[PDB]
């Protein structure tokens, strides 16, 4: 039944499963694992949790291709369907690592991933929100936390930073937090209550 | 190599076979698994046309209405369009005048357009006669093909005709 509680449970379960691989470094070889590896581990655990709870009818996970991840600035899309089989929400999730690639197009795509994610969310519409998920920070490299795009934008109207630096600035200064269950409690009934979340980050553990 | 690099877009309603068309042209394969395109994607294919290499970047658009904005933001720079409908779905064929208006509004570039009725292998479920499609193609000034992404009928011929029209406009 309830879609929001299961998606929050699945996000917590996938973060707990991904915690094992964060901060791994082998100095006699390649230090860090790839960002795509961490994304795929997170998505595999999330999708298996959602399949076990029977919520696949009202939740769609679309992992973006390499072209799509380049163009949209997003690593995957979560589509929340309603009882009427219409789309009620779309979360465009871009992941970042804070412990530390066009390949086919002919450039005009000089923008950062922040500006591409913002342009993607502008083009889809008001029911498409942008979400940054951060795997690891300077100090405590196994911490996973989320940030809504509009909170960053509200900080950029003050700080005048570019959005890529503005996200990293937001994550290391914000003390206030909101849990992912509380953030996703609304999720269907009102759209703006997601984006008026304010100067907080999203706590996942 | 590529003296010539052509931007093509495949547009039309949801479930007409646009992704299947692109995958059949690019990789020579077909899977029955329907996954709907989210937003837009593209593939690059190099071809030996009449003398020399031509690099096509072919953008598969999403047919659902909620992506109608974002797909139209990629009509710029297009030299070619595959407007595609389904011969087993009358709603897809009734939309093609709206799609042609969308091309004339958001793209024009004096770009060539070709009309493709996909799923011509499904003759038992045919709803749109081929005469209706070629009459509307004559009306709109477009070339016409009936194709099957599943059975690889008239798929590379449609792309070749579109590339030939683009070259003949130079
Ligand atoms: N019989 C038959 N089925 C086809 C053909 N082309 C596509 N299909 C089927 O039609 C369905 C939709 O195909 P698809 O390529 O996903 O269409 P689409 O235009 O990309 N959909 P969207 O715009 O929402 O992304 C799939 O189940 C596919 O197997 C064809 O030539 N013949
Ligand atoms: Mg598709």
Author numbering:
A (entry chain A): 18 to 117, 131 to 136, 138 to 236
B (entry chain B): 18 to 187
Can I see the authors' text?
All obtained complexes were used to perform the crystallization screen and finally, we obtained crystals for Rep15:Rab3CGppNHp_Q222H_10-227 (bovine), Rep15:Rab3BGppNHp and Rep15_ΔN1:Rab3BQ81L_18-190 complexes. Subsequently, we also obtained Rep15:Rab3BGppNHp and Rep15 ΔN1:Rab3BQ81L_18-190 complex crystals, which diffracted to a resolution 2.75 Å and 2.8 Å, respectively and crystallized in space group C2 and P21 respectively. We solved the Rep15:Rab3B complex structure using Rep15:Rab3C (bovine) as a MR model and Rep15 ΔN1:Rab3BQ81L_18-190 complex structure using Rep15:Rab3BGppNHp complex structure as a MR model. The asymmetric unit contained two copies of the complex. Both copies share nearly the same overall architecture, as indicated by an RMSD of 0.124 Å for Rep15:Rab3BGppNHp complex and and an RMSD of 0.109 Å for the both copies of Rep15 ΔN1:Rab3BQ81L_18-190 complex. Structurally-based sequence alignment of Rab3A and Rab3C shows that apart from the switch I, interswitch and switch II residues, three RabCDRs of Rab3A are involved in making contacts with the Rabphilin-3A, whereas in the case of the Rep15:Rab3 complex structures, RabCDRs are not part of the binding interface.
